[model samples]
Target chain A: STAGKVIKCKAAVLWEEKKPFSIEEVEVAPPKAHEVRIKMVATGICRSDDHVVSGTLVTPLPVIAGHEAAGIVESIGEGVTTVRPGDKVIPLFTPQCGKCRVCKHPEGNFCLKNDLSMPRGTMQDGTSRFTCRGKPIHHFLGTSTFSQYTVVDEISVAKIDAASPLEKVCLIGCGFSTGYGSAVKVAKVTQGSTCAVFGLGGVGLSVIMGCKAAGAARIIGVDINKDKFAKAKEVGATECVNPQDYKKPIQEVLTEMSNGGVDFSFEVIGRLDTMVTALSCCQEAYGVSVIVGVPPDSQNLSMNPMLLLSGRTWKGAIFGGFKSKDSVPKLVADFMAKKFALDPLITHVLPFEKINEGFDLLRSGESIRTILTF
Target chain B: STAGKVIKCKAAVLWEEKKPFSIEEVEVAPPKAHEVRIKMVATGICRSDDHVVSGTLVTPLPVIAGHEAAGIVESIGEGVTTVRPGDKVIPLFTPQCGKCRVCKHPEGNFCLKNDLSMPRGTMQDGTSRFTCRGKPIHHFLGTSTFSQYTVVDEISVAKIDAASPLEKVCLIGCGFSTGYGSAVKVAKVTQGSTCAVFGLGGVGLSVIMGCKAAGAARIIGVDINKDKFAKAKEVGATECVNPQDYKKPIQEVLTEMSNGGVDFSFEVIGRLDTMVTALSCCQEAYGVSVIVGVPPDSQNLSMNPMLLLSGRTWKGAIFGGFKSKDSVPKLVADFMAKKFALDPLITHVLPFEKINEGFDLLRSGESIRTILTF
Candidate 1:
């Protein structure tokens, strides 16, 4: 396909809920105005994608599923000046329109363009660029990098340095970026402080990495699974605690261990208990807890309001509070500068055909992240 | 009383749970090494006092019930130098020891010495200054200001201008200072922003005044009773609303009215529901909700974590986040400068004998504050 023409490619499409994606040929249309078409080189299989496949996160079916990806811009739409053809970029599931009030605010990264009413399977133009088996297929989070080629709004794509490894930086598109930004940007972790990362998954490890990067003196990794402890420490977690070992609540254990409570806490498990525990285990007055995981539908985080009253802060961070267009590129640069602990964390690199195996690995808690190659 | 001699005075003593105070003659001992004896001129009948009387707040029986009082220092102890005899002052229930880590921290106002297990009804020295019929009576919150003469830790007294009216400045010792600080200090409410205050009693009304003072363009007052609206408006509430008027949740009504929730919200009602609503009714990303009212024993605040995830913040304020020894005097000065809406909020001026009636007025939600003069 030429720079201005549509490209036909194969994509793994989820035709039904709770079913495996069927790898099939799909037609990728040329980018429209303010959009860019990309040839995806590498994509990370995230738990959010698994949730969408299992019907936990509602999305239109017969759509491609992969958001955390690094790809080359195969084409650029009319008026799309941020990137040109042949440029490498990462597409943001959480886009920065750059003109919204939220984007203009320094403390906020959630742009108004990514509101609740986002059409699940279409571009901002309310149309689908991919067609599977003669039927139009939807985009997932405006970045269906599961497909060989995808169309995304230019506002959703961040052009990165050419020297960066697409296979490695792909993890930063969602999980790594979310946790890192949460620590450094949202929580603004201080040097020589104590931090606790709840749920020693990829995001938790990233939180530990970021907190350590911020010069935190103690990084405690908390997880129900003891198996992840060894890997957690390699990524900068100074201590590991298994809640299963304690009869009392995890917050009590952590509080007792850290003298009062951790200076900072991150909940990346997407569970209500972990979220409550994360906030509950922070030191009073200046303790800050950032929620990095997406909770299940209708789950509420319950605790005595006294927790917040006594000086602990509870906040949520999406994509690690990163202004997708602005920070994602910087993250990629940081990764290129040898600033990330990515080498030890990426446990598996699987081809497109074995993508389900990677999901199985993640589901079984046998791997941290499994990068899928096209 | 002479500089080093004990004094005899009258106090309202609580001998049993859920019982009315018994006004009786008691002996107040001379100020100890780090204590000062005060002759209370006027005290504001706060809701916390009513709670203590109602047994909702746990305190030692035979304790004095007033904490928000303005008075003159009768005598200074051996080491008391912050104030001299005849100097006007306000006693802090929340004291600043000026040495604890909490006191040293720039952002914290909670002193370590004021722990929950603080000997209820006694001074920091672990002894009672008042005795009735040869039986020692307990002190209250380190500032047993209900008595005509009370002994307090030197660390707990803030010297104020003698020209300031003790009756009006008395309220700044608690409710007025608490609410005003919640808005201007803790929330740091920005100018021209919208705010919502739940519960239009003393604290809530003070919040409205503080928000208005901070240049809030819109201040919505929420309460169950419509009768308080006029008073609330007079104190800078741009709009008043009764939650009972709408079948839907108060948060939804407020969100709709404010066009996507208020920039700041305060829960001064102390109920769990109001705290949740106050947090829920704040704008996403930049909205801040402060819990000024203390909740009942062991009550949990439950909510969808989505509330925080979407960019809202929930915090708490004690004594309006003021360093009592440092900020109380400034508050008193502000009152003297006619800075607060104290006149409209003080609905009644009653004698010491009619203190119970003032509590009744507060319990029935018919009054903002009732000043009980000695």
Candidate 2:
């Protein structure tokens, strides 16, 4: 803890766009009012991180990437209460002050304060925390959690029990919450509702779990890879599909099997074609099609007006509209309760040094939710 | 009742649209089982009738004109318990037979049998009851009310108390029910909710009455005719607008008036630009645009994708998604109950022989609801 002295920390900082993260010793900022300083234990690589790295997503010069981090809080800001020093926590990608306009609504999930740095990667209060060669380091998603130590507003940190492993539940801050919450909160996949989870990957499996946990009577998982199907079936997927192999319209088949189409459908692959496929396999008068997965940068989502005209709705959702105060503990509790099958989801666990290896695992069409062990 | 065998009355029959209605003595058949001889009292000229006249709407050749009608039942085809001889009734433009697939669901006004045979000018069982020079005269919109005594199915008639005056309430059978139901039934306009009625004629004013019945706080009436504004306001419009005055941005002004837009808006005129205006002024999160206006044939109503994405819903309501059997009576009952201002909406009353003059009155856009006296 450095005994109340300024601490030095190791970080992978970028000096310019298209440059790889360079290791450097940097002075970590002290936590100010209503903020927390966290000693990172694990950080997961996300497609969003890749977007920032490739310059597709904008960030200030000299940036530190990574938003899906789990760790223990080392210091606290003045009047801080949501979390405390020494508390285990997850770093939220889009931090919520809770007092913001959008956070007041539980379902909106889009906190206005989170987009403060769109034009310039700086807080609304006008300040930058990190510096490389006296040049500032911009926050990726205002959550630069790639370093060994990171600072965040108190509202950004979701404290977990020390017993909860950073490698497992920390992801609930980003990908897991987003994917799972999509089913639980956005699609509102009801108990005994039939559903199809397209793309049996990270977000898709979370959808499968969310659907299963909600007591879905029928859960169909779709993927091109045959290997993904087994794990899909193992963790609440009642049926598996290969879209390329099917001839009949899947929406029709689902409708006939479930006494009408599925009550909800999750398009996890982040493609237009799959989005429509998911939309078609729905039965309710105003059937819900939740869109949680983000496609390539600059790629817009499209669907025929006909689908919307018939009361089918396609919505973009984030954190599955999860409120950390309400859902984070339950997610950890569910993991502790053994109520969810995270087993079928975790394909591999690798050390921080093997960070690049996880990306390779994703490229091989294998790996659903690979974690980084600190 | 005719004091002799069944015979056709003098009628105006159109062999094709845009041609003048030819008056001829057509031989009408006796009331078959479930049919009735309507000794026509009066019938109103409707725009849809003009759509059939001008061929903006295509129809079968040798078609008898008019749909909105009221008469005394001169004779009954056995088993017609709905009405008997001497019963005064209104011929519903859209029949709620109670035996169709749609009648089961209260929202099946589109199940009107007229949709199928209107093109062929025949009854549901595929036969015309009228003939001139040994040739069948096709029925238009289930009732050839332009004629002196049109033969109609018993299901088309709704027996009402003779005191209320059939000529007046008969207008409620079509246009009044259409506009009123669009607000109350289709859009569910609520108490103190803001709304915009996008026309000022019969249908739109009926919307005003329905909105008033629903206790809507501010009912804005938008129409090109400034002269009709007073009548519109008198019949329950909280405000009137000339689309020309707010030339550049009626949407912005309308939105401002309604505190970030109206809760509901109705397109009663069936024009594309008006439909857009109706949708543009709707509330941000949950505005509903009810399309009571029948747009040109095959012209799809257009709106930006973002409008729907942001929570605005566009619904194309068929005959107000009305259940004529239930709603037609409810409308009349509401009228008798003094809840709706149906009396103010009636602008003209003429003798039945001046049927062609009714068409001229409607064409002039001066009459809101015209009732023809027998």
Highest lDDT model number: 1
Candidate 2 segments exceeding 4 Å error: A2-81, A87-374, B2-165, B171-181, B184-292, B299-316, B319-324, B348-367, B370-374
Residue A209, candidate 2: C-alpha displacement in angstroms: 5.5
Candidate 1: tens digits of C-alpha lDDT, residues B231-264 = 8898899899998888999899999998767889
**DockQ-based class of model 1:** medium
Worst 10 residues of 2 chain B by lDDT: B302-311
| Candidate 1 C-alpha lDDT tens digits along A1-374 | 47777677889999988887888889889988999999999999888898888775677878898999999998898998899888989999988998866787677777767623234678888899999889999889889989899999888899999887999999889889887888898888899989999988888888888898899999999998899999989888998999989999999999899887888999888888888889889877668898877777766767888787766778886787778898888888888888775766688999987888988999898998899898
C-alpha lDDT score of every prediction, in listed order: 0.85, 0.71
User: What interface RMSD does every candidate have?
Assistant: 1.4, 5.8
TM-score of each: 0.93, 0.73
Q: Candidate 1: which pairs clash?
A: A178-A319, A178-A320, B121-B139, B285-B311
Report the lDDT tens digits of candidate 2 across residue range B135-205.
87778767788877877776676877656567677777778777787788778888988889988888888
